[PDB]
Each structure stands twice: as C-alpha cells, then as structure tokens.
Amino acid sequence: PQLHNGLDFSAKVIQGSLDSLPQEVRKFVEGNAQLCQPEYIHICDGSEEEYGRLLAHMQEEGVIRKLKKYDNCWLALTDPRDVARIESKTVIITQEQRDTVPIPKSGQSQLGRWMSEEDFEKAFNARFPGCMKGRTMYVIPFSMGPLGSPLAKIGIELTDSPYVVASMRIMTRMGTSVLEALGDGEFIKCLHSVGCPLPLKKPLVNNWACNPELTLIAHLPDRREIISFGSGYGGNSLLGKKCFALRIASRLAKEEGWLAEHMLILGITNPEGKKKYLAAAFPSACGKTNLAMMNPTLPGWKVECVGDDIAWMKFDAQGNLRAINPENGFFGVAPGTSVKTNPNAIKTIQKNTIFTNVAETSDGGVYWEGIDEPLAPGVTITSWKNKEWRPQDEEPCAHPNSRFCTPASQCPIIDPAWESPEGVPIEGIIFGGRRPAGVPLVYEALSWQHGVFVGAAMRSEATAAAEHKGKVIMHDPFAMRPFFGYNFGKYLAHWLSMAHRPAAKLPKIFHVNWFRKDKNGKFLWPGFGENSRVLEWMFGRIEGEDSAKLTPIGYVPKEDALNLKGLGDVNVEELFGISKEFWEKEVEEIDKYLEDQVNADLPYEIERELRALKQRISQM
Ligand SMILES: Nc1nc2c(ncn2[C@@H]2O[C@H](COP(=O)(O)OP(=O)(O)OP(=O)(O)O)[C@@H](O)[C@H]2O)c(=O)[nH]1
Ligand SMILES: O=C(O)C(=O)CS(=O)(=O)O
Ligand SMILES: [Mn+2]
Ligand SMILES: [Mn+2]
Ligand SMILES: [Mn+2]
C-alpha cells in the first residue's frame, strides 16, 4: 500500500516484473531502490540476448572494447586506483568482536577487521543514500553451486555496474531459473554500488566509475547480507566469490558442519587407470590456477580441473570428504600465463572471455608480461593505461593483477564431475606458499592434528593481490587470512573436530614449496607441468607406498622415490635440505604469531603440535 506514488517502482522496471518476484526478493529490491534511487531497474534473466545487449551497451559507453582477433572476447580498463581486493577496507560486522576475530594478546589482529553495527550504520548512511541516481539497478539472481546441489546457496546481487552483471554471468549460475529454484527460500542479500551517482562531479579515468576514498566491503553474517561500495573490481564487486563463497560461507559452514576454503580441486589419473581428487590451498598469486589446469610432463598421467579457487566440502554418510566447486568460471591472473606455463588456460580464454587491465595489440589481441609469444611485424601494443607502449618503458603493459574471466565449461580439461551435485571425494589436501628459503619442495604431515598445524603455520612472501609491498614473509594460515568469516581459533577447532567424526576418512595432508631459491636468486625447481612429479609421489603415498622418510618436520620422499628423470641437474640436496638454524627461527616466529594472534582461542592440540615440533628440532 501507499498514500502517494513514491514506493512502487514498477514504472521504472525496464526488464522483468516486480510482481513475479518472491515477496522477500521484491522487498529487498524495492527497499534498496527507495534508498539508492536508481533511474531504472533491470531484473536479469541470464539470457544470451540480454548479455549481447549489456556488451553492446558497455561498448557504446566506452566501458569495454571488442578484441577482434578472438571470438566474443572483450577488454575492460579500470581506474588505476581500482585494481585489486582492498583487504584494509573489508570488514565483518558482529555484535561481539570475538565472533569475528580472536582477541589478540597485545598486537592488532591480522585475522580480520571487525566493525561494530553502530559504526557500520554511520558508514552506510554516508555512502548509499542516492548513490545510484541516474543509473540502472541490475538485479542478479545467482546460484553458487549446481542449481539443485545440496550444498548450493542462492544470492541476489543488486548493482549499478553492467561490468559486474556480465562477469557474474560467467562466474556464477545466473538468471531466471535461479528465481524459480529459490521460491520463498532464504537467500544471501548482496548490495553493490560503484558510488558514482549522476550527474558526475568527478570525471572518470578510463570510463571506469569507482569511489576509492569511500570504498568499503562489509559483511553482516547474522543478517546474511553483503554490502559493497566504491570498487568495481574483482573480489570487491563480484560478491558471490570471495564475500559470499568464502567469508559468509565459512561462517555458515561452521554453523552447519561443512567447510568453505580457498582451494583448487583437481582430479589426477595415473597410468594404471586409477583416479584421485586433491584439494590445494595456496595464497593469492601462488599458483592454484596453474596447478588446477596443469599439463603434466609425465607420460600416462592426466589432470582434470574441478575448480581453481573455492571449494565447499563436507563429509557424506560414508565418511568421504566431498568437495564441490561453487563457481561457474575462472577469474585468473593473466600475466605469466603462456603456452609454456598454462597451455590449458590459453585454449580456454580465446572465446567468450572478458579481460580486465591487460594490453591490447593493434590487431585485436591481448598482451601481458610473460606471455612468451612474439608479435608480428607492424603490430603495436596499447598498455592497460590506454597508452602506446614499447618494451623500452620501465612499466609493464598489463597490470600485475590483471585478470581473465572465462567460462569453466570451455576448459578442455574440465573434469566430468565438476557439476555433479554430490561432489568429488577428496583424498589429499595440499598446503603451500612462496618460501624462497628453508622450506623443502614437499613434505607430508604426521597426523591430522599435525596437518592442521601445518595449515595454521603457512607463511608466504608478499604478492600483488591485496595491497602489500616489500620483501616480507607474512602469515597466511590455510591461505585464508583475507577470507575468514569468523574467529580463526574456532576455525582451527572446527578443522580439528573432523578427526572426531565416526568413519571419517581423513585425507592425507601435504605441504609444498615451488618457490625455493638458491644463493643465486634463481629457482631450484622448474615447476608448472613438472609439478606432476610431486603429485605422483603424493598419489603413491595416498595408496600406501613405502616411499617416505621421517624428518623433524614430517615425511619427505626417499632418495630416488621422486621421478627426476629428464630434469638433469636438479640440486636435490638444496631442494630437501632442512637446516636446524632456519627451523629454530621458524618455530619461534610461528610461536609468537599464534600466541599473539590467536591467544585464548588457540586449541590445545595446536599448541601441542607447536611444542612437539620445537622438541624435534631441538634434538637435531
Ligand atoms: N615459479 C613458479 N611460479 C608459478 C608456479 N605456478 C604458478 N606460478 C606463478 O604464480 C602466479 C600466480 O598463479 P595463479 O595460479 O594465477 O594463482 P592463484 O593461486 O590461482 O591466485 P588467485 O586466483 O588470486 O586465488 C603466476 O603468474 C605464475 O607465474 C610454479 O609452479 N612455479
Ligand atoms: O585474491 C584472490 O585470491 C582472487 O582469486 C582474486 S579476487 O577474486 O579476490 O579479486
Ligand atoms: Mn551514454
Ligand atoms: Mn583466490
Ligand atoms: Mn587463480
């Protein structure tokens, strides 16, 4: 009802019907339309026709360019201030801070940023009133997970950015059929705005609307709401991905007895016709997509990709840990991708793919650092800054965090069970990061509790995916430091509690380091497709082969248990060397970090593993 005509937004709907929406969905749309004051409302149906119109629109507005060399590929260039996740402006709102982070002993917490509800209410009111003036509010109904899967969750994202709509069509399962599956069920509420109401006060850089000063990505798990403002980029704007499927979902998983993790899922088949699935948690920019899509060098071996970034996992009735990939595409780092490093990615991204912040070649192609592919005479390069670029400048032609956004079904090695609603059974979990020194190529944990400790102890040198710089080794437990939805101490107790379940078939836990360097500063291990030799060892250990020897840090391959044939002069001594001096400093750094950062919420089993490791190292 109403006394005037201010609350019914039906006359502004340019696609779809407010009447056809489930009542709670309609309330969510109209209430925020009243707040944000969009000029039009577009209820997405996910059709090819709609997608063509969005692309055509964005091209007419100068937001994207067609890459004529390929089949239905497009390039978007952003404001150079809006190029990555912003960890420092990502907050979680709970009534009590201890729900979100452990209360640190003395330092500031690194395991999340908590914000009180009263403080958020002020931040929200300073940002969202009137923020979509003159723009279209797009209503994106999307499913994380196969539309019907038991672990599948549905969200509605409101946004004023057609770039978000187009990317969400690739990255999620999106459109009318999700609304039918939803009915009057629960959904995650996602509100996004680039924060540039019209008329524009500030002209735009690269036609890219954003509000860096006011950027805020907020999560309200008790209300099942994600609210994001000011950034159009990646993990800030595609709210189904990091915000929903890791942060909100890890809290739900704690509540409901499952796991939401920053992990790839791959299936690997050996020359004897046996196939196993492994999950791997590496931090951002540490190689998950390269491993998930690997072209193995070992003959008779095959790798198939289930997902490259997010895994949702749960024990089934039989005690198997089952994982699904909740995403519908890959949002992968472009620089360093080449026929040599990731050939299966090259095959995937040549059609139906949106590129963000890579270079354009004058003949309609893409360029980036490490593409390892020479151009023809007369071909010129336009950098991601929309400038002429010669390899004589100091700056790269593509932003280091530039991305492709591509449908998963196009991957030539996509696993046949990647959409199976029952998931794939996980038999091994891999942890790892960038460690230039000290940490061997691969080791295996001694027990479930030791393996949880290994995940908790993860460290990695700083990358270009958050907003960090310098040559610093930082802690990134479980590769989840930017993504915890709740208290990390309780997250550890959650993982440890999996060993208490009956008939639980606990996977083996490994740690890898592709990144160890010699005194020269050059890598000791060739990596990429050669990592299949490490997976072969893991495969045999899962089958029970007697191929390991005991060290103070866990099991390492026996000499000659690794197929090194063809690599030639690999320094096995340095790749698997374990120095007492290095590990005495390492355990101290882990001790200081867990004492300060997890404090009273640190499970005793984790402290016991820290003590045991300290003792094994002292006896060296
Ligand atoms: N030296 C070396 N570098 C690697 C290897 N695998 C991947 N990389 C490098 O790591 C960078 C990032 O790898 P990705 O696979 O895109 O990282 P990701 O873990 O999927 O990161 P997110 O999508 O941000 O979560 C690439 O540019 C690669 O060059 C490897 O085996 N050895
Ligand atoms: O940062 C990461 O791990 C990503 O996968 C990219 S974004 O989705 O966070 O932008
Ligand atoms: Mn216009
Ligand atoms: Mn990631
Ligand atoms: Mn990736």
Side-chain angles (χ1 to χ4, degrees), residues 101-417:
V101 288
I103 299 311
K105 205 162 183 180
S106 67
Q108 180 183 78
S109 178
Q110 301 180 12
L111 295 166
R113 297 209 189 261
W114 176 81
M115 198 180 272
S116 68
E117 176 49 54
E118 296 83 356
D119 295 325
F120 177 61
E121 188 188 358
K122 301 172 189 178
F124 180 88
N125 292 328
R127 282 161 175 86
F128 277 91
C131 66
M132 299 184 183
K133 210 82 174 191
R135 295 187 189 280
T136 294
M137 163 180 289
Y138 297 94
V139 180
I140 306 169
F142 67 96
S143 176
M144 302 304 292
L147 193 54
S149 171
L151 285 178
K153 308 291 188 177
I154 287 172
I156 307 287
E157 178 165 344
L158 315 179
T159 179
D160 48 12
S161 166
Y163 170 89
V164 168
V165 178
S167 306
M168 286 291 282
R169 181 181 200 265
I170 297 167
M171 290 307 295
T172 69
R173 297 161 172 95
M174 191 264 274
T176 299
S177 67
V178 177
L179 284 169
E180 288 172 340
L182 173 62
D184 269 1
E186 307 284 348
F187 56 98
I188 304 305
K189 303 169 194 192
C190 304
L191 176 62
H192 175 251
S193 176
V194 299
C196 291
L198 312 171
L200 286 182
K201 328 179 194 65
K202 319 174 180 182
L204 298 182
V205 180
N206 266 336
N207 286 322
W208 183 265
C210 64
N211 195 321
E213 310 171 355
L214 294 184
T215 295
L216 190 63
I217 307 94
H219 311 69
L220 295 90
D222 298 313
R223 319 170 75 91
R224 316 284 194 241
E225 296 181 12
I226 302 166
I227 297 175
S228 179
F229 187 88
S231 174
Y233 198 88
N236 303 325
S237 72
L238 315 180
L239 297 187
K241 182 167 177 65
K242 303 297 186 171
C243 297
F244 181 162
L246 286 187
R247 294 201 198 86
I248 290 305
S250 63
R251 160 84 163 244
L252 303 180
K254 175 66 179 58
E255 297 173 15
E256 299 164 12
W258 50 282
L259 303 167
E261 305 292 341
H262 193 198
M263 295 177 177
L264 69 94
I265 305 161
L266 60 77
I268 177 158
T269 302
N270 78 345
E272 306 293 339
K274 318 290 190 301
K275 178 173 182 170
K276 298 184 181 304
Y277 289 88
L278 314 166
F282 307 144
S284 326
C286 291
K288 289 186 304 295
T289 297
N290 286 266
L291 188 66
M293 297 187 181
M294 145 172 50
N295 185 39
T297 55
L298 288 184
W301 287 82
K302 176 174 188 153
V303 174
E304 295 166 285
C305 180
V306 177
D308 75 332
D309 197 57
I310 301 191
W312 291 358
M313 312 190 293
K314 186 173 49 53
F315 291 94
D316 66 18
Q318 317 294 329
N320 304 288
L321 184 61
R322 309 203 72 93
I324 61 134
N325 168 22
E327 310 201 275
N328 199 29
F330 313 114
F331 187 64
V333 172
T337 305
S338 74
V339 177
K340 293 193 182 183
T341 59
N342 200 343
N344 283 322
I346 298 299
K347 299 178 176 197
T348 307
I349 60 178
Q350 300 192 35
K351 58 190 169 196
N352 305 316
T353 292
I354 299 179
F355 299 84
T356 304
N357 284 341
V358 303
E360 184 183 2
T361 63
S362 59
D363 62 341
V366 296
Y367 218 61
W368 47 74
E369 279 61 35
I371 191 171
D372 201 56
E373 183 162 351
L375 297 175
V379 180
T380 52
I381 296 174
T382 302
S383 73
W384 74 284
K385 291 164 175 285
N386 215 30
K387 299 177 181 178
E388 275 282 281
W389 180 95
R390 279 191 287 169
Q392 279 61 41
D393 302 328
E394 189 198 6
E395 56 176 3
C397 63
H399 189 277
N401 192 47
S402 54
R403 298 272 174 171
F404 53 83
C405 185
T406 197
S409 66
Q410 290 179 182
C411 188
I413 54 164
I414 204 69
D415 195 87

Side-chain angles (χ1 to χ4, degrees), residues 488-533:
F488 169 64
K490 301 312 168 212
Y491 171 97
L492 292 168
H494 192 53
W495 270 81
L496 290 162
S497 74
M498 298 303 163
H500 302 174
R501 303 175 61 106
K505 301 162 184 168
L506 298 176
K508 267 173 149 42
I509 285 172
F510 305 93
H511 189 275
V512 301
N513 179 26
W514 311 144
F515 297 95
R516 201 182 187 158
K517 294 181 166 178
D518 59 359
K519 306 180 179 181
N520 290 326
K522 304 179 181 182
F523 293 106
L524 288 158
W525 180 248
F528 301 98
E530 302 303 347
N531 293 336
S532 62
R533 300 161 192 271

